[PDB]
């Protein structure tokens, strides 16, 4: 009897769906809705209207290029009165002459994306299936069952709906606030976001599974952090917004600015954050002039539960789109629980630095990381300081025990090993001890410069850099640097002093060890031989010598001796021929022992290349 239904059209109820779903700006032409919340379609039929007693209607939805029911990317569901909460469902909520108003709901953990919605109409003995249309399904911060649920309306407004904000920069002391147009809801932007997902490496590797994994904001946040930077494929490699950048792509704060735009667009509550660092003739700074430290650094935080981790990690997750990184729970960073996925040590190193001295074991505060961590206040044009979410107050028990959890005893001093003399070559050592059970891989910078008695530094006279020095547990090393006369001879100060400095960097936790030591290059000793016998009577001969310590010969060599109680007249002696390298120059002079007790003979040796060398000898 009854003839099959003919659909005249489907009304996508854009105005009503858009407002309820907080997607109004996105629903000018196509339907955009959020998961775990009912939305509406109105069917107009040509001819007779739906009759439940006769007509059976079934819906099918698919997303992606390899949809399956088991993967959650395909569903089939009948139009009926019973509504199973948490499932794909459709039910009648209004029936007029020629119209049929439907209420559909998706699971709160449905993969996000572009769905094709089809309808199968069946009047017993016959059926006809066809395409009703499409809708995009987004994350839903308004739905208590959704992983990105945020229990505060004003926060949902700020971190999802608001299209402009501030990205903080400048410095910790002069914080500047660049205003920025995220423009997540502008024409074309949503489609661009979906494309970015569709060309990510995991899609290429397994499209069906990628599309299925888009049920998770953990997974989606992760993919986006990775996609912002052109490894290639990525987006980035002046402006005041994200929109232009994304449009051109389809055809440093900027990295975070773009991630925020994309994440807000997809429905993940997100904010840009800025960390400031500061510095205060230091090896460290010299080092920095691919893990640079900058005056500031930006990333994003996104809001979600973490069922993939142990309990207690829901909330803000750090994601770092800077040249995949995250998401890591901010609280895991503050707790030094660095085994928490994803990439915790990297985020920890952005807000921590442990700098220790051995300027002979003291704390060095010339490098300071993790200050004034900043993000825009909710619903107000001002700055919120969130330093506290990342680190405990300096000096607290909680700070220290987090330091411990993060580190699970390393030491370094400068050593020489033997006598050091002007003119000779010799090694210096960075002696490094590692009385821990851990294994470390460090950068080492070890280098020497002349230095004046006033503390001013001369030119470099030795450098050894090692990219990757390994330290085994419970072991030590003496790493040598050769100091060459040839390299220091020309650049010595008034002193015979050289400053040795070493810097050990463990870049994972972000630890820094300095050691520093001044060395004195001894002058040759003047040997004074007393020939005869100390007679309160008379007549004595003193012999003085000096072995040349240079690898080169000395010219213009002259001794000068004097000593009240021994000689009555000072005696200068010019040595005629130059003294060869290693040669021992020798002169003699006569003495007339004045009186009885002790006397001191005082000698000065002079030369063109070696000057002001002194000696003395007591007598009697």
């Amino acid at each position: 009897h009854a003839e099959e239904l003919v659909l005249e059209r489907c009304d996508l109820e854009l105005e009503t769906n858009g407002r309820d779903h907080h997607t109004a700006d996105l629903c000018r032409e196509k339907l955009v809705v959020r998961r775990g919340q009912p939305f509406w379609l109105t069917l107009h039929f040509e001819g007779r209207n739906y009759e439940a007693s006769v007509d059976s209607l079934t819906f099918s939805v698919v997303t992606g290029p390899a949809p399956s029911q088991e993967a959650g990317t395909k569903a089939r569901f009948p139009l009926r009165d019973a509504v199973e909460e948490g499932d794909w469902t459709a039910t009648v909520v209004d029936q007029q002459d020629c119209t049929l108003s439907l209420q559909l709901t998706t699971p709160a953990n449905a993969p996000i994306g572009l769905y094709r919605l089809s309808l199968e109409a069946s009047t017993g003995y016959q059926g006809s299936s066809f395409v009703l249309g499409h809708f995009i399904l987004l994350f839903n911060a308004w739905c208590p069952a959704d992983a990105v649920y945020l229990d505060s309306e004003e926060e949902r407004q700020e971190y999802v709906l608001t299209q402009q904000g501030f990205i903080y920069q400048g410095s910790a002391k002069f914080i500047k606030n660049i205003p920025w147009n995220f423009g997540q809801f502008e024409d074309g932007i949503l489609d661009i976001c979906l494309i970015l997902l569709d060309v990510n490496p995991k899609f290429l590797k397994n499209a069906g599974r990628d599309c299925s994994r888009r049920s998770s904001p953990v997974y989606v946040g992760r993919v986006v952090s990775g996609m912002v930077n052109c490894n290639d494929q990525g987006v980035l490699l002046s402006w005041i917004g994200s929109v232009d950048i994304l449009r051109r792509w389809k055809n440093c704060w900027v990295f975070a600015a773009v991630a925020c735009t994309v994440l807000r667009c997809l429905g993940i509550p997100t904010r840009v954050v800025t960390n400031y660092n500061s510095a205060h003739s230091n090896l460290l700074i010299e080092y920095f002039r691919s893990e640079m430290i900058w005056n500031f650094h930006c990333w994003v935080e996104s809001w979600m539960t973490r069922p993939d981790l142990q309990p207690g990690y829901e909330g803000w997750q750090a994601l770092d789109p800077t040249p995949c990184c995250g998401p890591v729970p901010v609280r895991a960073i503050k707790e030094g629980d660095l085994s928490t996925k994803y990439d915790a040590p990297f985020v920890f190193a952005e807000v921590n630095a442990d700098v220790v001295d051995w300027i002979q074991k003291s704390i060095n505060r010339s490098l300071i990381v993790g200050l004034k961590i900043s993000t825009k206040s909710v619903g107000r044009d001002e700055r919120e300081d969130i330093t506290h979410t990342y680190k405990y107050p300096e000096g607290s028990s909680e700070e220290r025990e987090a330091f411990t959890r993060a580190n699970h005893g390393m030491a370094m001093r400068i050593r020489v090993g033997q006598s050091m003399n002007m003119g000779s070559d010799f090694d210096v050592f960075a002696h490094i001890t590692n009385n821990t059970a851990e294994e470390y891989v460090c950068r080492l910078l070890l280098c020497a410069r002349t230095v004046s008695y006033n503390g001013i530094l001369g030119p470099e006279c030795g450098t050894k850099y090692l990219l990757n020095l390994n330290l085994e547990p419970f072991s030590e090393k003496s790493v040598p640097l050769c100091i060459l006369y040839e390299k220091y001879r020309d650049c010595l100060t008034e002193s015979n002093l050289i400053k040795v400095r070493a810097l050990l960097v463990e870049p994972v936790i972000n630890s820094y060890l300095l050691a520093e030591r001044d060395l004195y290059l001894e002058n040759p000793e003047i040997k004074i031989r007393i020939l005869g016998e100390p007679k309160q009577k008379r007549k004595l001969v003193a012999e003085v010598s000096l072995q040349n310590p240079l690898p080169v010969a000395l010219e213009g060599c002259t001794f000068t001796v004097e000593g009240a109680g021994l000689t009555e007249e000072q005696k200068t002696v010019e040595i005629p021929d130059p003294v060869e390298a290693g040669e021992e120059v020798k002169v003699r002079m006569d003495l007339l022992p004045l009186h009885m007790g002790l006397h001191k003979l005082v000698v000065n040796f002079e030369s063109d290349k070696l000057k002001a060398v002194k000696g003395f000898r007591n007598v009697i």
Partner: peptide, 4 residues
């Protein structure tokens, strides 16, 4: 953005 400037290196320290």
């Amino acid at each position: 953005a400037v290196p320290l």
